[PDB]
């Protein structure tokens, strides 16, 4: 379990900047800026509690009943979806310092296609990702619907408590040595250029394609490039099945990010 262990350890430096609208005129500097170590395999929203705890004593409003506003993360004045692994959002945007800069924002109009944060069950969404992944792999979602309620719960809990053993045990109960399809998502940079993303249908029954073999579906996302998966370069002669079974994210999907060579 060497590779996966390395993926579970993936961690980024995150600079969280709290908009002034959240705080009271005069509050100190330290409250407005959080510095944290966030895993690649998790959701930003899983660290919101940590942000509330640090800025609650300076809120410029009563969060219990004052009014209804929406909260969401932003990168360079651009809404960021929290429903993607942190590592995936990173690859998507990327002495030399490597860090992710996030800005907390509030508003009345919730940005289009953005799911609100603090009406947002991260655990439910996540569980469904794995449901979908199970169906794509087996043609049915029975393997995950067979987990006891406890396992499903121990499963999400491993992400929060960061328990590798539990995650590996449950996530394993959802895999195939002979998948019908590959749960694959392809994206481009949100930073430079235009942004596109796709979920091509890639049958596996009786085949063993390499990225090259399916470059047709890969290059389609944006109509020589480099294939980035889990923050690293991937050889085009690599087997799709091995790449999936080894580098898939904590939500069950394999993500490929294309970057200009």
């Amino acid at each position: 379990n060497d590779i996966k262990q390395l993926l579970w350890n993936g961690e980024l430096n995150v600079l969280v900047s709290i908009d002034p609208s959240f705080l009271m005129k005069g509050s100190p500097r330290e409250i407005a800026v959080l510095r944290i170590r966030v895993p690649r395999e998790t959701y930003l929203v899983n660290y919101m509690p940590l942000i509330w705890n640090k800025i609650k004593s300076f809120l410029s409003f009563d969060p219990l009943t004052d009014s209804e506003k929406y909260f969401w993360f932003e990168h360079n004045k651009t809404p960021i979806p929290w429903n993607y692994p942190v590592g995936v959002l990173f690859d998507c945007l990327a002495d030399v310092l490597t860090f992710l800069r996030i800005h907390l924002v509030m508003g009345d109009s919730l940005p289009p296609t953005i799911i609100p944060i603090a009406k947002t069950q991260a655990e439910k969404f996540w569980f469904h990702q794995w449901k979908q992944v199970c169906f794509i792999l087996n043609g049915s979602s029975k393997a995950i619907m067979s987990l006891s309620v406890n396992e499903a719960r121990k499963f999400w809990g491993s992400v929060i408590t960061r328990n590798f053993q539990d995650f590996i045990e449950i996530s394993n109960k959802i895999s195939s040595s002979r998948p019908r399809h590959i749960p694959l998502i392809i994206q481009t940079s949100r930073t430079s250029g235009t942004f596109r993303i796709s979920q091509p249908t890639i049958s596996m029954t009786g085949v063993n394609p390499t990225l090259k073999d399916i470059e047709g579906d890969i290059l389609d996302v944006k109509e020589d490039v480099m294939v980035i998966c889990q923050g690293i370069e991937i050889p085009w002669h690599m087997l799709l099945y091995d790449l999936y079974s080894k580098l898939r994210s904590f939500d069950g999907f394999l993500y490929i990010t294309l970057v200009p060579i």
């Binding site: 060497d2 993926l7 980024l12 944290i36 490597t98 889990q230 690293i232 080894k246």
Partner: peptide
């Protein structure tokens, strides 16, 4: 066997490059 070694090595670098200056965070 060998592709795994390349995977294991690139990720190991990744973690280290991404952990650099983690003292500031």
């Amino acid at each position: 066997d060998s592709m795994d070694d390349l995977l294991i090595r690139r990720l190991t670098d990744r973690n280290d490059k991404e952990a650099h200056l983690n003292e500031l965070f």
